[PDB]
Amino acid sequence: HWGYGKHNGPEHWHKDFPIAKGERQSPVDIDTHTAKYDPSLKPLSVSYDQATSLRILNNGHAFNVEFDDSQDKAVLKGGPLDGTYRLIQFHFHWGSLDGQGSEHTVDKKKYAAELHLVHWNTKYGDFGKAVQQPDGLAVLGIFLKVGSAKPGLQKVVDVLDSIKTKGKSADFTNFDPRGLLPESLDYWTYPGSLTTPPLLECVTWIVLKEPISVSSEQVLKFRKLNFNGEGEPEELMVDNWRPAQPLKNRQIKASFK
Ligand SMILES: CCc1cc2c(cc1OS(N)(=O)=O)CC[C@@H]1[C@@H]2CC[C@]2(C)[C@@H](OS(N)(=O)=O)CC[C@@H]12
Ligand SMILES: [Zn+2]
Ligand SMILES: [Zn+2]
């Protein structure tokens, strides 16, 4: 089964998922000097006030905080998008060291981690149908750097020991994702794909310019999670990120000067 090891990592994915070598794969390196400022781009609209988290799960790749997407309780709109996109879940990608971990890079710089808030286009009814569409998903990417602690992330960090291994899950209600956002919503945007199999090219990527800072203690608790399932040889869950892919015939647009 695909993973992030020497024998089943990103380099091996194309065998079971040919689209890994497609025309609009993600992540990609964001060259801030070649990114085009587009004055017609609109401010991003993040409406997370009625968000309803349900639980946190360790899927063997990363951990997911899921939300109730049966109503327009937490949506992303505006920016480069048309219509409404419902938040279904958020997860992270981190490294074994602070110098690596993010999937997207900025002028080749890699951050310690990357938060992905996944939303699907409401015009497609459900997430399953959305992924089969070129504009079915909108993933808000937010870089994480190590420094001061992020208060809004502590509730997440403290429950990880309860889902240490693959398959484990636990209730996780009333978590507010607004505590995970940086001050500015300035962003870069480009058409891409899921960064893990099935690697479907259904994503409008929106990557925030301003990263959030987390403490070394917080990211350390991320690295204590396991890739393996309970009762198996321990393999720490680290470096679950896919490297940058060829931009090909795409242009990264910036919402700010
Ligand atoms: C709905 C299609 C589908 C998608 C996804 C999975 C299983 C799926 O079902 S399948 N292919 O096994 O029948 C498992 C891994 C999922 C992926 C959708 C995109 C996800 C949330 C990724 O988000 S990301 N990095 O922002 O692109 C992380 C894990 C990914
Ligand atoms: Zn899996
Ligand atoms: Zn992701």
Coordinates of C-alpha atoms and ligand atoms in Angstrom, one line a residue:
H1 CA 0.0 0.0 0.0
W2 CA 1.3 3.5 -0.8
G3 CA 3.1 5.4 1.9
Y4 CA 6.2 7.5 2.4
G5 CA 9.0 4.9 2.6
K6 CA 11.9 3.9 0.4
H7 CA 9.7 1.2 -1.2
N8 CA 6.3 2.8 -1.4
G9 CA 6.9 6.5 -1.3
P10 CA 6.1 9.4 -3.8
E11 CA 8.6 8.0 -6.4
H12 CA 6.7 4.7 -6.5
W13 CA 3.2 6.1 -6.7
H14 CA 2.9 6.4 -10.5
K15 CA 2.8 2.6 -10.8
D16 CA -0.6 2.3 -9.2
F17 CA -1.6 5.9 -10.0
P18 CA -0.4 6.9 -13.5
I19 CA -1.7 10.5 -13.1
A20 CA 1.2 11.1 -10.8
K21 CA 3.0 12.2 -14.0
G22 CA 0.0 14.3 -15.1
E23 CA -0.2 17.9 -16.4
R24 CA -1.5 19.6 -13.2
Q25 CA 0.1 17.8 -10.3
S26 CA 0.7 19.3 -6.8
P27 CA 2.6 20.4 -4.8
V28 CA 4.8 22.9 -6.7
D29 CA 7.4 25.4 -5.9
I30 CA 6.0 29.0 -5.7
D31 CA 8.4 31.3 -7.5
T32 CA 7.3 34.7 -6.0
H33 CA 9.0 36.6 -8.8
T34 CA 7.3 34.7 -11.6
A35 CA 3.9 34.6 -9.9
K36 CA 1.6 37.0 -11.5
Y37 CA -0.2 39.7 -9.5
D38 CA -3.9 39.6 -10.6
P39 CA -5.8 42.7 -9.5
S40 CA -9.1 41.1 -10.5
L41 CA -8.6 38.4 -7.9
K42 CA -10.9 38.9 -4.9
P43 CA -10.3 38.8 -1.2
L44 CA -10.7 35.2 0.2
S45 CA -13.9 34.6 2.1
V46 CA -13.5 32.3 5.1
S47 CA -16.7 31.7 7.0
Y48 CA -15.9 29.3 9.8
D49 CA -18.2 30.5 12.6
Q50 CA -20.7 27.6 12.6
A51 CA -18.1 24.9 12.1
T52 CA -18.8 21.5 13.6
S53 CA -15.8 19.2 14.1
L54 CA -16.6 15.5 14.7
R55 CA -13.5 13.5 15.4
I56 CA -9.8 13.0 14.8
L57 CA -8.4 10.0 13.0
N58 CA -5.0 8.5 12.4
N59 CA -5.2 7.1 8.8
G60 CA -1.7 5.7 8.7
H61 CA -0.5 8.6 6.5
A62 CA -1.4 11.6 8.7
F63 CA -4.2 12.5 11.1
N64 CA -7.5 14.1 10.1
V65 CA -9.9 16.3 12.0
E66 CA -13.3 15.8 10.3
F67 CA -16.2 18.2 10.2
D68 CA -19.9 17.9 9.5
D69 CA -20.3 18.9 5.9
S70 CA -24.0 18.1 5.6
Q71 CA -24.8 21.9 5.7
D72 CA -23.0 25.1 4.8
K73 CA -21.6 25.5 8.3
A74 CA -18.0 26.2 7.4
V75 CA -17.3 27.5 3.9
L76 CA -14.7 29.1 1.7
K77 CA -15.7 31.5 -1.0
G78 CA -14.5 34.4 -3.0
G79 CA -10.8 34.6 -3.8
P80 CA -10.4 32.9 -7.2
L81 CA -13.4 30.6 -6.6
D82 CA -16.9 30.7 -7.9
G83 CA -19.6 29.3 -5.7
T84 CA -19.3 27.8 -2.2
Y85 CA -16.9 25.2 -0.9
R86 CA -17.6 23.2 2.3
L87 CA -14.9 22.3 4.7
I88 CA -14.8 18.5 5.0
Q89 CA -11.5 18.1 7.0
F90 CA -8.1 19.4 7.7
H91 CA -4.8 17.5 8.1
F92 CA -1.1 18.3 8.1
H93 CA 2.2 17.3 6.4
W94 CA 5.3 17.6 8.5
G95 CA 8.9 16.5 8.6
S96 CA 11.4 14.7 10.8
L97 CA 13.2 18.0 11.1
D98 CA 12.1 21.7 11.2
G99 CA 13.9 22.3 7.9
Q100 CA 11.5 20.1 5.9
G101 CA 7.9 19.1 5.9
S102 CA 5.8 21.4 3.7
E103 CA 4.6 20.2 0.4
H104 CA 4.5 23.5 -1.4
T105 CA 7.7 25.5 -1.3
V106 CA 8.3 29.3 -1.7
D107 CA 11.3 30.2 -3.8
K108 CA 12.5 26.7 -2.9
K109 CA 12.2 27.2 0.8
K110 CA 10.6 24.4 2.7
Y111 CA 8.6 25.0 5.9
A112 CA 8.4 22.7 9.0
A113 CA 4.8 21.7 8.1
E114 CA 1.8 22.5 6.0
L115 CA -1.9 22.6 7.1
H116 CA -4.5 21.7 4.5
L117 CA -8.1 22.7 5.0
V118 CA -10.0 20.7 2.4
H119 CA -13.3 22.0 0.9
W120 CA -15.5 20.6 -1.8
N121 CA -17.7 22.4 -4.4
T122 CA -21.3 22.3 -3.2
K123 CA -22.5 22.2 -6.7
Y124 CA -21.3 18.6 -6.8
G125 CA -23.3 17.3 -3.8
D126 CA -20.6 15.3 -2.1
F127 CA -16.8 15.0 -1.8
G128 CA -16.8 11.7 -3.8
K129 CA -18.3 13.4 -6.8
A130 CA -16.3 16.6 -6.4
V131 CA -12.9 14.9 -6.8
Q132 CA -13.9 13.8 -10.3
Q133 CA -14.3 17.5 -11.4
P134 CA -11.6 20.0 -12.4
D135 CA -13.0 22.6 -10.0
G136 CA -14.4 20.2 -7.4
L137 CA -12.0 21.0 -4.6
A138 CA -10.4 24.1 -3.0
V139 CA -7.6 23.3 -0.5
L140 CA -6.4 26.2 1.6
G141 CA -2.7 25.6 2.3
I142 CA -1.1 27.3 5.3
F143 CA 2.6 27.0 6.1
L144 CA 3.9 26.3 9.6
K145 CA 7.2 27.5 10.9
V146 CA 8.7 26.7 14.3
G147 CA 8.7 29.5 16.9
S148 CA 6.1 30.8 19.3
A149 CA 3.2 28.4 20.1
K150 CA -0.1 28.6 18.3
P151 CA -2.8 28.6 21.1
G152 CA -5.5 27.5 18.7
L153 CA -3.6 24.3 17.8
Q154 CA -3.1 23.0 21.4
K155 CA -6.5 21.1 21.6
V156 CA -5.3 19.1 18.5
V157 CA -1.9 18.4 19.9
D158 CA -3.1 17.1 23.3
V159 CA -5.3 14.4 21.8
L160 CA -2.7 12.8 19.6
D161 CA -1.5 10.2 22.1
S162 CA -5.1 8.8 22.0
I163 CA -4.7 8.1 18.3
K164 CA -1.0 7.1 18.2
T165 CA -1.4 4.3 15.7
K166 CA -3.0 3.5 12.3
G167 CA -6.7 3.0 12.5
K168 CA -7.3 4.7 15.9
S169 CA -9.8 7.5 16.1
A170 CA -11.4 9.6 18.9
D171 CA -14.2 12.1 19.4
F172 CA -13.2 15.6 18.8
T173 CA -16.0 18.2 19.0
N174 CA -16.2 22.0 19.2
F175 CA -12.8 22.5 17.7
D176 CA -12.6 25.9 16.0
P177 CA -10.4 26.1 12.9
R178 CA -10.3 29.9 13.0
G179 CA -7.7 29.6 15.6
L180 CA -5.4 28.1 12.9
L181 CA -5.4 31.1 10.6
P182 CA -2.7 33.8 10.2
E183 CA -3.5 37.5 10.3
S184 CA -3.4 38.1 6.5
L185 CA -5.3 36.2 3.9
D186 CA -3.1 37.3 1.0
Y187 CA -2.5 34.3 -1.3
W188 CA -1.2 32.5 -4.4
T189 CA -3.5 30.3 -6.5
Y190 CA -3.1 27.8 -9.3
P191 CA -4.8 24.7 -10.6
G192 CA -3.5 21.4 -9.3
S193 CA -4.3 18.0 -7.6
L194 CA -4.6 16.0 -4.5
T195 CA -1.0 15.5 -3.1
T196 CA -1.6 11.8 -2.2
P197 CA -3.1 9.0 -4.2
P198 CA -5.5 9.0 -6.0
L199 CA -3.7 12.2 -7.0
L200 CA -6.8 13.5 -8.8
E201 CA -6.4 16.8 -10.6
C202 CA -9.5 18.4 -9.1
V203 CA -7.9 21.1 -6.9
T204 CA -7.9 24.9 -7.0
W205 CA -5.0 25.6 -4.7
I206 CA -5.0 28.6 -2.5
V207 CA -1.8 29.0 -0.5
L208 CA -1.5 31.7 2.1
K209 CA 1.5 34.0 2.0
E210 CA 1.7 34.4 5.7
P211 CA 2.7 31.2 7.7
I212 CA 1.6 30.5 11.2
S213 CA 4.1 29.8 13.9
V214 CA 3.9 26.7 16.2
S215 CA 6.2 25.7 19.0
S216 CA 8.9 23.0 18.9
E217 CA 6.9 21.1 21.6
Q218 CA 3.8 21.1 19.4
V219 CA 5.5 19.8 16.2
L220 CA 7.3 17.3 18.4
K221 CA 4.0 15.7 19.4
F222 CA 3.2 15.5 15.7
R223 CA 6.4 13.4 15.3
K224 CA 5.4 11.0 18.1
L225 CA 2.5 9.6 16.0
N226 CA 2.9 6.2 14.3
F227 CA 2.6 5.1 10.6
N228 CA 2.2 1.5 11.7
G229 CA -0.8 0.0 13.4
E230 CA -1.0 -1.0 17.1
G231 CA 1.1 -4.0 17.9
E232 CA 3.5 -3.7 15.0
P233 CA 7.1 -2.5 14.7
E234 CA 7.1 1.2 15.5
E235 CA 7.7 3.6 12.5
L236 CA 7.3 7.2 13.5
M237 CA 5.0 9.3 11.4
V238 CA 7.3 11.8 9.9
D239 CA 8.1 13.2 6.5
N240 CA 4.6 12.5 5.1
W241 CA 5.0 15.1 2.4
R242 CA 5.2 14.9 -1.4
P243 CA 8.0 16.9 -3.1
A244 CA 7.4 19.7 -5.6
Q245 CA 6.2 18.6 -9.1
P246 CA 6.8 20.2 -12.5
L247 CA 4.6 23.3 -13.0
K248 CA 4.4 22.6 -16.8
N249 CA 2.0 24.9 -18.5
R250 CA 0.6 26.6 -15.5
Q251 CA 0.9 30.2 -14.1
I252 CA 0.7 30.9 -10.3
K253 CA -1.4 34.0 -9.6
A254 CA -0.9 36.3 -6.6
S255 CA -3.7 38.2 -5.0
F256 CA -1.3 40.8 -3.6
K257 CA 1.4 43.2 -4.8
Ligands
LIG1 C1 -12.9 10.3 -2.8 C2 -11.7 9.7 -3.5 C3 -10.7 9.4 -2.4 C4 -9.7 10.2 -1.9 C5 -8.7 10.3 -1.1 C6 -8.6 9.0 -0.4 C7 -9.6 8.0 -0.7 C8 -10.6 8.1 -1.7 O1 -11.5 7.1 -1.9 S1 -10.9 5.7 -2.8 N1 -10.0 6.2 -4.0 O2 -10.1 4.9 -1.9 O3 -12.1 5.0 -3.3 C9 -7.6 8.8 0.7 C10 -6.5 9.9 0.8 C11 -7.1 11.3 0.6 C12 -7.8 11.4 -0.8 C13 -8.5 12.8 -1.0 C14 -7.5 14.0 -0.7 C15 -6.7 13.9 0.6 C16 -7.7 14.3 1.8 C17 -5.4 14.6 0.8 O4 -5.5 16.0 0.9 S2 -4.5 17.0 0.0 N2 -3.1 16.7 0.4 O5 -4.9 18.3 0.4 O6 -4.6 16.8 -1.4 C18 -4.8 13.9 2.1 C19 -5.3 12.5 2.1 C20 -6.1 12.4 0.8
ZN2 ZN -4.0 4.4 3.1
ZN3 ZN -2.6 17.5 2.3

